Amino acid sequence: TPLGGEPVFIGENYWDKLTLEYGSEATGTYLRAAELKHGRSAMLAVTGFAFHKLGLTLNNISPHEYLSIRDNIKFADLAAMSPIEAVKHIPAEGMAQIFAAIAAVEIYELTHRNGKLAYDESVAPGLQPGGLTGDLGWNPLNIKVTDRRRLSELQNGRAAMFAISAWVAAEAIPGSVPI
Amino acid sequence: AFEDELGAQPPLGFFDPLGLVADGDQEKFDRLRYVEIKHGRISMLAVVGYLVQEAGVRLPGTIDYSGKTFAEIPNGFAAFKEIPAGGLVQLLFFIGVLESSVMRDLTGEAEFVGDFRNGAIDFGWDTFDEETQFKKRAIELNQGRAAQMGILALMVHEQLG
Amino acid sequence: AFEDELGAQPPLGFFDPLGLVADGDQEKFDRLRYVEIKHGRISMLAVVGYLVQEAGVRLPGTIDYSGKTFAEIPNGFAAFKEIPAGGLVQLLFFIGVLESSVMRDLTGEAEFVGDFRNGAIDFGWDTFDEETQFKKRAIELNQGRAAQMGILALMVHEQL
Amino acid sequence: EMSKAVPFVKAPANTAGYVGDVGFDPLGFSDYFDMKWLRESEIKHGRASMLACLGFVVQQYITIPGYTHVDDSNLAPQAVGVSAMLQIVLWMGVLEFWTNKGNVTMETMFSSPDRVPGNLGFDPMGLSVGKSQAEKDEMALKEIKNGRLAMLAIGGMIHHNWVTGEPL
Ligand code: CLA
Ligand code: CLA
Ligand SMILES: CCCCCCCCCCCCCCCC(=O)OC[C@H](COP(=O)(O)OC[C@@H](O)CO)OC(=O)CCCCCCCCCCCCCCC
Ligand SMILES: CC(=O)O[C@H]1CC(C)(C)C(=C=C/C(C)=C/C=C/C(C)=C/C=C/C=C(C)/C=C/C=C(\C)C(=O)C[C@@]23O[C@]2(C)C[C@@H](O)CC3(C)C)[C@](C)(O)C1
């Protein structure tokens, strides 16, 4: 009773073992939510990696290449030391900042149920059965929310995930296929 | 009795030289499929292991923090000589947790034996006719039969030289 | 009174000189028999142990990774104290899982032992002959009943 | 009439509709104190113990980057300081005020006809939602028992090291 699966072929398999025997319908939602989160994350990661490999960084695309602004961290040096060895050169301040935005988003996905935050509750809205559906409601200039869009998004998600995993593996060690 | 079952196939067909399902001395109508499938599944990951685990493709880095790399570990029963004995227990143990916790009929909806997951080797598979099941469950079962003679070879030929 | 039970074979018949199943309780026979069948074969594996060991037949190889071999091991009560400390633990462990796994088979006193196909091997109770089992289970009890007096010999004919 | 657990003292009254009921109260605390508070205590003592039993073992082998590996879990606070320790317990407080909508004492808690013991509303995955009563009772017997094992456990893990001076 889940959403559309593989377009060429379909297979649910490992789904009725937890959404009927182990868990229930509430677990179904949760699983889908997790999947969507991961998918989106993978997509963004993929794009970032692609950009880094290509060369479109601050030095190439804009007038500013000095990220550290005190730690002498230029974009040229970070674009010459690959993608995996560049994330470790990010200044602590910046890391802290990034963690902040993500934290805020996660908290929102946790407190603000529907339109506004809920002041009195035993637990957070998203910590209850079916707490997080997957959709945050963030639809700026929303073009459409149909039954095709969702499926497309999901597909792009898994694909992105696989792609980035493979990319990381190859940078690290002999993969298998070409890039 | 079981001449029309899975595994009976040309050129031999039903071929029981010991008279094993010839009676129920220890309920041979069941569990002998399960004992035949289970050894071969070990052997198929063993021989697709051991041949690739002879060709020279290794994991990066070290087996621990003390610097012992994976590339220094050869193939064979010699590979267990360069496993420290704390590893030999844990290699058994969380595999031994799988025997009691996933390697049994958990949910009770098993059409067969070796039937645990139901949905993840569904490789565009739902479309295929019930006959395609009997094909690639003979092809499961007969890869596992023939990978034991692969792995019993590749264990004895190392000790024979 | 308590005749036609398992293993009352005649060279005697009704072996009760002092009233022990009658003045036990209603049922201690159901304990006592479960209790007897386990004592019989621990004696059997003691007798079949202590004899095959005494002939010098050993397992080829070492018992641990530090180089203690099986052929360096004499017999009597001097062989349990020789197999190492960790080597005794793994003996006692998956024995101690199995007085747990066999005493608790949804009935305690109705069925006897909790047959040897509990672990790694699987039992069939359906193939169940009425006449065949009376002799074979009464051989088996009475093999152990002599084996207990036989192992009580070789445990006590060491000290004197 | 007599206790099921220890069958030579009288059966404790007012412990009937509870999950791990085997009639074990020889000192009679349930005669004197409110039973909803005692259950809520036993669950909470158990959940903190189960998290501390994982913690005590996993801390030896895994350590998060930035901290110092300590051979014995017991010596960890000294290796983390006091500022980090106070942050933990003061946030535990804030997590506890929100938990029971502000009713944090033995007089304010269980003042609503709702608010049964141990029901936090916590269930993000959906474990035990829409099922029958026997199954719910069975899974509640598991949380109590594993929590009681973990309390007597987390003693031994902590205590073992007290005498000796080396990890588990
Ligand atoms: C991090 C992102 C974020 C967002 C977008 C919001 C947004 C909002 N907050 Mg929250 N808040 C946040 C973080 C956030 N907050 C943090 C970190 C805190 C402190 C922990 C708070 C503390 C807080 C308090 C105490 C209060 C709110 C209030 C509100 C809402 C205004 C009141 C109202 O009537 O609107 C309701 C909105 C609608 C009727 C329109 C619904 C349309 C949906 C789609 C919402 C708009 C899209 C969504 C907000 C965008 C988020 C996506 C993200 C990727 C950007 C508004 C929706 C007030 C409130 O909601 O209660 C009265 C309020 O009292 N906020
Ligand atoms: C963390 C990300 C994540 C999560 C939570 C899910 C979750 C889900 N997927 Mg899924 N998927 C993912 C990534 C993910 N997927 C990726 C990368 C792909 C591309 C290969 C797919 C392709 C896929 C298909 C084609 C379909 C789903 C479907 C489903 C749903 C039912 C299957 C199920 O019970 O779970 C699946 C099992 C798990 C999530 C268990 C977790 C895995 C274990 C813990 C570790 C595995 C590590 C592994 C070695 C990583 C290497 C990758 C692998 C291919 C070897 C479920 C909501 C089906 C659906 O929507 O309903 C019919 C469906 O049609 N997924
Ligand atoms: C850094 C952490 C600070 C964040 C504050 C977290 C707020 C907690 C959530 C409030 C509950 C909201 C739920 C329902 C809202 C509600 O109605 O409940 C309000 C709650 C009491 O609620 P009730 O009235 O229902 O409780 C029963 C009463 O009727 C008493 O009979 O009181 C508080 O909010 C206390 C908040 C903590 C105050 C912290 C200040 C620290 C003072 C400590 C002084 C130290 C002295 C040292 C010795 C000298
Ligand atoms: C039958 C069978 O085969 O199995 C069945 C059962 C089974 C297996 C359970 C199933 C499943 C579920 C699956 C497969 C779930 C898998 C999910 C998966 C594989 C999820 C990956 C996420 C990756 C992420 C989030 C990476 C983010 C990457 C991020 C956030 C980055 O920052 C990227 C980064 O590069 C940037 C951009 C810049 C760099 O400076 C820094 C780094 C390098 C970090 C299926 C589908 O039912 C099939």
mmCIF file of N, CA and C in Angstrom, chain B residues 19-96:
data_model
loop_
_atom_site.group_PDB
_atom_site.id
_atom_site.type_symbol
_atom_site.label_atom_id
_atom_site.label_comp_id
_atom_site.label_asym_id
_atom_site.label_seq_id
_atom_site.Cartn_x
_atom_site.Cartn_y
_atom_site.Cartn_z
ATOM 1 N N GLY B 19 18.992 -44.199 -0.969
ATOM 2 C CA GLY B 19 17.657 -44.439 -0.449
ATOM 3 C C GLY B 19 17.291 -43.472 0.654
ATOM 4 N N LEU B 20 17.541 -42.179 0.443
ATOM 5 C CA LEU B 20 17.432 -41.192 1.512
ATOM 6 C C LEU B 20 15.978 -40.791 1.763
ATOM 7 N N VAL B 21 15.219 -40.443 0.716
ATOM 8 C CA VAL B 21 13.779 -40.216 0.883
ATOM 9 C C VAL B 21 12.991 -41.494 0.665
ATOM 10 N N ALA B 22 13.682 -42.635 0.597
ATOM 11 C CA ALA B 22 12.995 -43.908 0.405
ATOM 12 C C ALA B 22 12.115 -44.281 1.593
ATOM 13 N N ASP B 23 12.352 -43.693 2.767
ATOM 14 C CA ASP B 23 11.397 -43.749 3.865
ATOM 15 C C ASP B 23 11.478 -42.452 4.662
ATOM 16 N N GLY B 24 10.659 -42.372 5.703
ATOM 17 C CA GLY B 24 10.810 -41.373 6.740
ATOM 18 C C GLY B 24 11.544 -41.876 7.969
ATOM 19 N N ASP B 25 12.843 -42.188 7.866
ATOM 20 C CA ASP B 25 13.552 -42.667 9.053
ATOM 21 C C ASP B 25 13.801 -41.532 10.045
ATOM 22 N N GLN B 26 14.054 -40.325 9.540
ATOM 23 C CA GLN B 26 14.199 -39.136 10.375
ATOM 24 C C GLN B 26 13.512 -37.947 9.683
ATOM 25 N N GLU B 27 12.316 -38.196 9.132
ATOM 26 C CA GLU B 27 11.513 -37.227 8.366
ATOM 27 C C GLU B 27 12.347 -36.620 7.231
ATOM 28 N N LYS B 28 12.661 -37.485 6.274
ATOM 29 C CA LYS B 28 13.486 -37.075 5.150
ATOM 30 C C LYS B 28 12.700 -36.361 4.071
ATOM 31 N N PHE B 29 11.395 -36.232 4.236
ATOM 32 C CA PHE B 29 10.632 -35.522 3.228
ATOM 33 C C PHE B 29 10.813 -34.020 3.394
ATOM 34 N N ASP B 30 11.126 -33.584 4.609
ATOM 35 C CA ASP B 30 11.466 -32.204 4.897
ATOM 36 C C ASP B 30 12.879 -32.131 5.462
ATOM 37 N N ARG B 31 13.381 -30.884 5.485
ATOM 38 C CA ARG B 31 14.670 -30.439 6.018
ATOM 39 C C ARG B 31 15.847 -30.884 5.146
ATOM 40 N N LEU B 32 15.645 -31.812 4.217
ATOM 41 C CA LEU B 32 16.791 -32.213 3.413
ATOM 42 C C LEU B 32 17.000 -31.282 2.248
ATOM 43 N N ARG B 33 15.919 -30.658 1.791
ATOM 44 C CA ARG B 33 16.049 -29.477 0.959
ATOM 45 C C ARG B 33 16.773 -28.376 1.721
ATOM 46 N N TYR B 34 16.368 -28.139 2.975
ATOM 47 C CA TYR B 34 16.932 -27.053 3.773
ATOM 48 C C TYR B 34 18.396 -27.303 4.120
ATOM 49 N N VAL B 35 18.771 -28.561 4.352
ATOM 50 C CA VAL B 35 20.171 -28.880 4.622
ATOM 51 C C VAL B 35 20.993 -28.845 3.327
ATOM 52 N N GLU B 36 20.364 -29.104 2.175
ATOM 53 C CA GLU B 36 21.089 -29.015 0.907
ATOM 54 C C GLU B 36 21.254 -27.572 0.443
ATOM 55 N N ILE B 37 20.235 -26.731 0.649
ATOM 56 C CA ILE B 37 20.333 -25.335 0.231
ATOM 57 C C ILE B 37 21.348 -24.585 1.094
ATOM 58 N N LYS B 38 21.379 -24.885 2.400
ATOM 59 C CA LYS B 38 22.126 -24.073 3.361
ATOM 60 C C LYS B 38 23.634 -24.200 3.178
ATOM 61 N N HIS B 39 24.126 -25.420 2.933
ATOM 62 C CA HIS B 39 25.551 -25.612 2.675
ATOM 63 C C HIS B 39 25.983 -24.900 1.401
ATOM 64 N N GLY B 40 25.146 -24.959 0.361
ATOM 65 C CA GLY B 40 25.534 -24.411 -0.927
ATOM 66 C C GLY B 40 25.590 -22.899 -0.924
ATOM 67 N N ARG B 41 24.702 -22.259 -0.153
ATOM 68 C CA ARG B 41 24.715 -20.805 -0.021
ATOM 69 C C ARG B 41 25.981 -20.315 0.653
ATOM 70 N N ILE B 42 26.509 -21.108 1.578
ATOM 71 C CA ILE B 42 27.845 -20.868 2.102
ATOM 72 C C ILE B 42 28.869 -21.004 0.988
ATOM 73 N N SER B 43 28.723 -22.047 0.168
ATOM 74 C CA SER B 43 29.727 -22.378 -0.836
ATOM 75 C C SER B 43 29.708 -21.416 -2.016
ATOM 76 N N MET B 44 28.541 -20.860 -2.355
ATOM 77 C CA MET B 44 28.473 -19.931 -3.480
ATOM 78 C C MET B 44 29.136 -18.603 -3.142
ATOM 79 N N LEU B 45 28.892 -18.077 -1.939
ATOM 80 C CA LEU B 45 29.645 -16.915 -1.481
ATOM 81 C C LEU B 45 31.098 -17.262 -1.198
ATOM 82 N N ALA B 46 31.394 -18.534 -0.924
ATOM 83 C CA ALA B 46 32.780 -18.941 -0.738
ATOM 84 C C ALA B 46 33.530 -18.958 -2.062
ATOM 85 N N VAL B 47 32.957 -19.587 -3.094
ATOM 86 C CA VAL B 47 33.720 -19.731 -4.328
ATOM 87 C C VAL B 47 33.740 -18.423 -5.120
ATOM 88 N N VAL B 48 32.671 -17.620 -5.068
ATOM 89 C CA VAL B 48 32.724 -16.295 -5.675
ATOM 90 C C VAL B 48 33.548 -15.368 -4.791
ATOM 91 N N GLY B 49 33.626 -15.668 -3.497
ATOM 92 C CA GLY B 49 34.678 -15.113 -2.676
ATOM 93 C C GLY B 49 36.037 -15.581 -3.153
ATOM 94 N N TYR B 50 36.344 -16.876 -2.962
ATOM 95 C CA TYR B 50 37.720 -17.389 -2.984
ATOM 96 C C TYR B 50 38.425 -17.174 -4.318
ATOM 97 N N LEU B 51 37.691 -17.218 -5.433
ATOM 98 C CA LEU B 51 38.317 -16.939 -6.723
ATOM 99 C C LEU B 51 38.641 -15.455 -6.867
ATOM 100 N N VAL B 52 37.717 -14.583 -6.460
ATOM 101 C CA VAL B 52 38.021 -13.159 -6.368
ATOM 102 C C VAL B 52 39.003 -12.906 -5.224
ATOM 103 N N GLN B 53 38.950 -13.723 -4.167
ATOM 104 C CA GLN B 53 39.871 -13.621 -3.037
ATOM 105 C C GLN B 53 41.162 -14.391 -3.273
ATOM 106 N N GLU B 54 41.403 -14.801 -4.521
ATOM 107 C CA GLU B 54 42.704 -15.206 -5.034
ATOM 108 C C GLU B 54 43.293 -14.209 -6.028
ATOM 109 N N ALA B 55 42.443 -13.481 -6.765
ATOM 110 C CA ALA B 55 42.881 -12.648 -7.883
ATOM 111 C C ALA B 55 43.721 -11.449 -7.458
ATOM 112 N N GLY B 56 43.641 -11.033 -6.201
ATOM 113 C CA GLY B 56 44.499 -9.988 -5.692
ATOM 114 C C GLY B 56 43.858 -8.633 -5.499
ATOM 115 N N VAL B 57 42.536 -8.565 -5.381
ATOM 116 C CA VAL B 57 41.832 -7.324 -5.081
ATOM 117 C C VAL B 57 41.600 -7.277 -3.578
ATOM 118 N N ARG B 58 42.099 -6.226 -2.931
ATOM 119 C CA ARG B 58 42.134 -6.130 -1.481
ATOM 120 C C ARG B 58 41.375 -4.899 -1.002
ATOM 121 N N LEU B 59 40.986 -4.924 0.279
ATOM 122 C CA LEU B 59 40.476 -3.713 0.905
ATOM 123 C C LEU B 59 41.638 -2.783 1.247
ATOM 124 N N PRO B 60 41.418 -1.468 1.210
ATOM 125 C CA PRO B 60 42.469 -0.529 1.615
ATOM 126 C C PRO B 60 42.716 -0.561 3.113
ATOM 127 N N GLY B 61 43.811 0.087 3.502
ATOM 128 C CA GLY B 61 44.060 0.369 4.897
ATOM 129 C C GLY B 61 44.517 -0.846 5.685
ATOM 130 N N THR B 62 44.196 -0.827 6.975
ATOM 131 C CA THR B 62 44.699 -1.796 7.934
ATOM 132 C C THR B 62 43.549 -2.550 8.587
ATOM 133 N N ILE B 63 43.835 -3.779 9.038
ATOM 134 C CA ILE B 63 42.816 -4.596 9.699
ATOM 135 C C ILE B 63 42.505 -4.068 11.098
ATOM 136 N N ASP B 64 43.392 -3.278 11.687
ATOM 137 C CA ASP B 64 43.159 -2.759 13.027
ATOM 138 C C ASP B 64 43.783 -1.371 13.113
ATOM 139 N N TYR B 65 44.007 -0.908 14.337
ATOM 140 C CA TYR B 65 44.727 0.336 14.548
ATOM 141 C C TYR B 65 46.237 0.151 14.575
ATOM 142 N N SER B 66 46.728 -1.073 14.778
ATOM 143 C CA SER B 66 48.154 -1.310 14.971
ATOM 144 C C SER B 66 48.926 -1.467 13.660
ATOM 145 N N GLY B 67 48.315 -1.147 12.519
ATOM 146 C CA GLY B 67 49.040 -1.001 11.273
ATOM 147 C C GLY B 67 49.110 -2.223 10.383
ATOM 148 N N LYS B 68 48.572 -3.365 10.815
ATOM 149 C CA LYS B 68 48.577 -4.581 10.003
ATOM 150 C C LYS B 68 47.634 -4.405 8.822
ATOM 151 N N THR B 69 48.184 -4.304 7.615
ATOM 152 C CA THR B 69 47.334 -4.022 6.472
ATOM 153 C C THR B 69 46.639 -5.291 5.986
ATOM 154 N N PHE B 70 45.650 -5.090 5.116
ATOM 155 C CA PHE B 70 44.971 -6.209 4.481
ATOM 156 C C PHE B 70 45.797 -6.815 3.358
ATOM 157 N N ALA B 71 46.673 -6.019 2.734
ATOM 158 C CA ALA B 71 47.483 -6.501 1.623
ATOM 159 C C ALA B 71 48.556 -7.481 2.071
ATOM 160 N N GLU B 72 48.915 -7.467 3.354
ATOM 161 C CA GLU B 72 49.852 -8.435 3.901
ATOM 162 C C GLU B 72 49.205 -9.777 4.203
ATOM 163 N N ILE B 73 47.884 -9.876 4.125
ATOM 164 C CA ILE B 73 47.167 -11.100 4.467
ATOM 165 C C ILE B 73 46.966 -11.908 3.188
ATOM 166 N N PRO B 74 47.578 -13.093 3.062
ATOM 167 C CA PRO B 74 47.406 -13.904 1.851
ATOM 168 C C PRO B 74 46.071 -14.625 1.794
ATOM 169 N N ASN B 75 45.941 -15.514 0.818
ATOM 170 C CA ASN B 75 44.745 -16.316 0.627
ATOM 171 C C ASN B 75 44.900 -17.674 1.304
ATOM 172 N N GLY B 76 43.762 -18.256 1.660
ATOM 173 C CA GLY B 76 43.657 -19.644 2.029
ATOM 174 C C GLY B 76 43.422 -19.835 3.511
ATOM 175 N N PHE B 77 43.760 -21.039 3.980
ATOM 176 C CA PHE B 77 43.819 -21.290 5.413
ATOM 177 C C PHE B 77 44.962 -20.532 6.076
ATOM 178 N N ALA B 78 45.914 -20.028 5.283
ATOM 179 C CA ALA B 78 46.943 -19.134 5.788
ATOM 180 C C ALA B 78 46.396 -17.773 6.190
ATOM 181 N N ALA B 79 45.227 -17.390 5.673
ATOM 182 C CA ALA B 79 44.632 -16.113 6.047
ATOM 183 C C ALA B 79 44.146 -16.116 7.490
ATOM 184 N N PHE B 80 43.768 -17.283 8.014
ATOM 185 C CA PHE B 80 43.357 -17.381 9.407
ATOM 186 C C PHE B 80 44.542 -17.378 10.363
ATOM 187 N N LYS B 81 45.753 -17.649 9.865
ATOM 188 C CA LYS B 81 46.938 -17.549 10.710
ATOM 189 C C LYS B 81 47.299 -16.099 11.000
ATOM 190 N N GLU B 82 46.920 -15.174 10.117
ATOM 191 C CA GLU B 82 47.157 -13.755 10.329
ATOM 192 C C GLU B 82 45.892 -13.013 10.754
ATOM 193 N N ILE B 83 44.873 -13.744 11.191
ATOM 194 C CA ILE B 83 43.794 -13.186 11.999
ATOM 195 C C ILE B 83 44.162 -13.409 13.463
ATOM 196 N N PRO B 84 44.271 -12.359 14.278
ATOM 197 C CA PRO B 84 44.379 -12.566 15.726
ATOM 198 C C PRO B 84 43.098 -13.166 16.288
ATOM 199 N N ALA B 85 43.251 -13.925 17.377
ATOM 200 C CA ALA B 85 42.197 -14.820 17.848
ATOM 201 C C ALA B 85 40.978 -14.090 18.399
ATOM 202 N N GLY B 86 41.099 -12.801 18.724
ATOM 203 C CA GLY B 86 39.919 -12.024 19.053
ATOM 204 C C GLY B 86 39.012 -11.817 17.858
ATOM 205 N N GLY B 87 39.594 -11.730 16.661
ATOM 206 C CA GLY B 87 38.789 -11.610 15.463
ATOM 207 C C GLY B 87 38.064 -12.889 15.105
ATOM 208 N N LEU B 88 38.695 -14.046 15.347
ATOM 209 C CA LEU B 88 38.120 -15.339 14.974
ATOM 210 C C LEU B 88 36.816 -15.628 15.707
ATOM 211 N N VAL B 89 36.659 -15.106 16.922
ATOM 212 C CA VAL B 89 35.422 -15.296 17.671
ATOM 213 C C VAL B 89 34.318 -14.400 17.128
ATOM 214 N N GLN B 90 34.628 -13.118 16.899
ATOM 215 C CA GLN B 90 33.609 -12.170 16.456
ATOM 216 C C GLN B 90 33.187 -12.421 15.019
ATOM 217 N N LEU B 91 34.090 -12.968 14.199
ATOM 218 C CA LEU B 91 33.705 -13.419 12.867
ATOM 219 C C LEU B 91 32.681 -14.538 12.952
ATOM 220 N N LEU B 92 32.805 -15.410 13.945
ATOM 221 C CA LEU B 92 31.773 -16.418 14.140
ATOM 222 C C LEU B 92 30.515 -15.818 14.759
ATOM 223 N N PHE B 93 30.679 -14.874 15.695
ATOM 224 C CA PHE B 93 29.615 -14.568 16.651
ATOM 225 C C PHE B 93 28.455 -13.803 16.017
ATOM 226 N N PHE B 94 28.717 -12.669 15.369
ATOM 227 C CA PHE B 94 27.595 -11.945 14.767
ATOM 228 C C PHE B 94 27.128 -12.644 13.475
ATOM 229 N N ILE B 95 27.897 -13.603 12.936
ATOM 230 C CA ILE B 95 27.293 -14.582 12.023
ATOM 231 C C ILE B 95 26.459 -15.599 12.810
ATOM 232 N N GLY B 96 26.916 -15.992 14.003
ATOM 233 C CA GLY B 96 26.134 -16.904 14.823
ATOM 234 C C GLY B 96 24.871 -16.280 15.387
#
